[PDB]
Symmetry: D2
Subunit: 334 residues, 4 copies
């Protein structure tokens, strides 16, 4: 498989490392800067530490353990040399091309003009697109796909959890909060942003912001369309997040132990192993940094009242779990 990455940022760089480790042929990276900057950011990661490979930069390329990866600095995805380079899958991780096509550009440009076979959009699309969450609607992948969204980090945490709860107990409806690490969409100090909350100094506050992630479960689990909604609180941690899901279940005599038992068992099945995890250790968000699961249920936190009213907490490394899924998905598309 020949991979290209468009947007060598937090997701782009984690995807790179995970894919490189698997022996995938990463042919080219496109961003808006020079090879020296990209090589330096790849080598030294504030969140995850020092990359253990030999990293160099050259004219038009970075070199990783002797493997040379082409660097492009092309703002307009229509202009990318993907056919020339024989690109099988483009990872679209710039954050700025979440419509199919546009005046400034769109994710379908990678396939329709630039000549790549396939594109994975690393964010929910603003329009209609095949959306996959691994462990949830894997079956929806076929060989003829040209464009797929891997949804959001939060949907990837929430959808597997909701799938198991719905299949076991039935969800009538649910509301959620993600208490969520800050990201590069936010601001270091107060500065203009179209979202007036995200305008605010990110390491100084708990910052409410809207999320479509709970509604988006309906795209991958149609039975739950219209049944889930929620909100997000951006807090001052650099990575690591937690979904806090409050559900009304159809099983009106459901207990804490029954909920934890089905979640534990589900995490051990071949369909969800490595995707849904379960723990009973009293951990904190730092403990999940670099964890490849989409969703790790904190069993100690499960809380149940009468009549199927329940709260489930599930951890995820919003960068690393999600990036592993993007690579998992790339390999399945081929």
């Amino acid at each position: 498989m020949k991979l290209a990455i468009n947007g060598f940022g937090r997701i782009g760089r984690n995807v790179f490392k995970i894919a490189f480790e698997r022996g995938i042929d990463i042919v080219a990276i496109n961003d808006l800067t020079d090879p020296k900057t990209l090589a330096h950011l790849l080598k030294y990661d504030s969140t995850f530490g020092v990359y253990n490979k030999k990293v160099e930069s050259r004219d038009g390329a970075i070199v990783v353990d002797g493997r040379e990866i082409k660097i492009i600095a092309e703002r307009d995805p229509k202009n990318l040399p993907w056919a020339k380079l024989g690109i099988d899958v483009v990872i679209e991780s710039t954050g700025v091309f979440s419509s199919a096509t546009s005046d400034k550009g769109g994710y379908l440009d990678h396939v329709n003009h630039a000549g790549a076979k396939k594109v994975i959009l690393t964010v929910p699309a603003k329009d209609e697109i095949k959306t996959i969450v691994l462990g949830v609607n894997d079956h929806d992948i076929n060989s003829d796909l040209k464009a797929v969204s891997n949804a959001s980090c939060t949907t990837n945490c929430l959808a597997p959890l909701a799938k198991v709860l719905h299949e076991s107990f039935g969800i009538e409806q649910g509301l959620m909060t993600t208490v969520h690490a800050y990201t590069n969409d936010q601001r270091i100090l107060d500065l203009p942003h179209s979202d007036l909350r995200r305008a605010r100094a990110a390491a100084l506050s708990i910052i409410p912001t809207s999320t479509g992630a709970a509604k988006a479960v309906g795209l991958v689990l149609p039975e739950l369309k219209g049944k889930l909604n929620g909100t997000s609180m951006r807090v001052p941690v650099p990575t690591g997040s937690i979904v806090d899901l409050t559900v009304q279940l159809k099983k009106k005599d459901v207990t804490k132990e029954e909920i934890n038992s089905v979640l534990r068992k589900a995490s051990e099945t071949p369909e969800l192993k490595g995707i849904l995890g379960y723990t009973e250790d009293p951990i904190v968000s730092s403990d999940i940094k670099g964890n490849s699961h989409s969703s790790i249920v904190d069993g100690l936190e499960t809380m149940v009242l009468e009549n199927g009213f329940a709260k489930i907490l599930s951890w995820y490394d919003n960068e690393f779990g999600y990036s592993t899924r993007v690579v998992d998905l790339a390999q399945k598309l081929v």
Copy 2:
């Protein structure tokens, strides 16, 4: 009225500043250190800034704008000279005397052998104590009371919210999470703690921890006994917290606009003004720092799914709002 403060910490010092500004006669402070240290901590507050008063220290006292306050350093409260000093109300804000008595003392030592007329415990009691949340069960205050708890900051945020929702719509059940500033009960870096989550570096992680604050709503709103529970997430901000309440209401056609409507109305009443606030500004936690309200509904976040299943978010400065309540309560007691 003569006030003494036992434990001149985050709560003790805020209570001091609020009471002093009202002209209350603050007779003495007891802690475990010298007057120079207490004067310095009073003068320079990392969270709220420099105290705009002349602060002096001397042998056995501090002086604030020419008013002398005695400093005591007695670890066992049974030994405190409250009768001799004529103390009407002792504020018990050490964090270590949350039982009535023990082989190392308790909050009743203040009103039994030490001889103060009354004690406010600035935390829920580990045993049973008369518990008051202003704006909610003011009627329970009578001149015969000796010992009262002002409950927790979180209960002070939640209970007024619950009161209004219950009176307007009826509350079937609800679950909550507080996304909560770190406190001095936590650890700067990983260090032993009886709570293995609170053992962890407080500025580095989202840290789940149990809370009795939702169940405690039942102490002050007896109709809601058994109907609420929840959890806490401690996050890296030094003050400012938010209650995220997910509630099943009895009014099945309730809308978000209706919910915001009754909360906004309640905020303007004489019973709840100064206690329950309401905003529709897209604020963040740093904006509620130093706000004296117990509970500030974030109107933009209100959300209803189907059939009375609703989500409501409310801000509180866990130090400052709560400390104002402690002073308000002391004044009501006499």
Copy 3:
């Protein structure tokens, strides 16, 4: 006088507040966004708190306590209507126009094409310009000036300190470090930046970065040209910084007491009162937040070895002290 602000950022908004309080006629603000965003950022400051004034927005204006300030969104400073509006002084605080002229624009555009009388550049110029540091070279202010740099925050801390030490003891040479709050020039998480140090997650690390602030002392104190250099360390605080100055003095038997005595005396002189402060309180960076001085000597930190080898530490709020100087300077120009 009629003031305009170009770039309503950290400096721009603080300059606004300080100027407004002085009754200065702030005619217009230019930035890159709408009035609602600008009003919201003025009202709610993560660093400094809630602006206690009635702040409103309308089409092409914000209103503060009933006073209307025009809002413009014009990227090219050549196109600004300063002549039409009668602007006496423009504050150039976008950070992107530090050359007099350029293809994209420069600070002189405000006067030569846009028709304002005078411009203050809120940063060192990349070219030759009149550079003023109040308390250091005030006499260089003449009524015919069209363009002036107020230098940097760090030069404003360092220059008055160097002036006093040089006048009293003589500086042979000096090296310095500023331990400095992060700024909007930095990144919330690792992201491309022309400076590979400033590319890194700003709240996560100590970040060395170059500074010309010590060389720049030579612009306002010619006797110290070529005599000072230094470096910066950006650290995870949102404002508040400290100069750490290590100097070789000409007085070879100079003592800590003598150094502190001249600094304390200088801080009480008409020339430097409100510019250079001196303290002997054991404070930390939070305590200088919102302080209007350019430089506050930490007297307890003064350290002297043999032969005039001395170390002096001086605090500054890099936003607020500097912003106060910008407004002082505006008033001196007219």
Copy 4:
């Protein structure tokens, strides 16, 4: 070698992990808590991640990858069973026994009454003690030593650096600052502390604090006695620190490149390899997290003004580099 650790904290646990990897027999840990808490802290580290070994707790013991280690909970070190357990070297890392003896115990209790053969004090002694900095005064180690201090993390950074500079160029005098991670000696929010600056919320400020680390260089390099002094600034990072050394050298025509060349060359010698490191990458503090060097010169930062007046910066993980030296020292003592 039989090792015991007294004080299983940040240093004690890092020492444990390093020693464990080397096959050192860790016989016993003493602290003030139970085995579950110590096992939990060992397994989950907020700073360094999840420990990749099976960790279990039982009565009076923990087990690490099948190796059993005794857990003791004895406050007074004179009562420790070191003779009975055959302890060769005790690591004294509680932070509360920095005097040889007192009415509450001291470091010599380990070797006098408790009956260990040797004790390493992981801090400068408050009284006189044989002090070793590896890479500097190794020759001072002999078989007759009963009690030694490994000095401080800052002395371990500064001393190897000063050694090379003095050998190559001669040091006349020097002054330094360490910009330094917070530690458990500090406070999460403002709280009493005998050091009024260390009393202040650790993650909210730059906090000046005194240090004997530069003067202590004279203990391990007698030619530099009385020639160095310095101060510390505690800043909001959990680990990772940097020494900023301003030094007057004897070679008056020395250049930045010359300084860097001797430092680079010294870092490759058998005496200093693994102790003194050298880089020319534009790194930040997060990048030295988990680095085992005592001192890593930041070559890009090296600066020379005139006449041998120079500035050198060197990184250190104050926890991990120092803890590696402690283990190195333990092995050299036997």
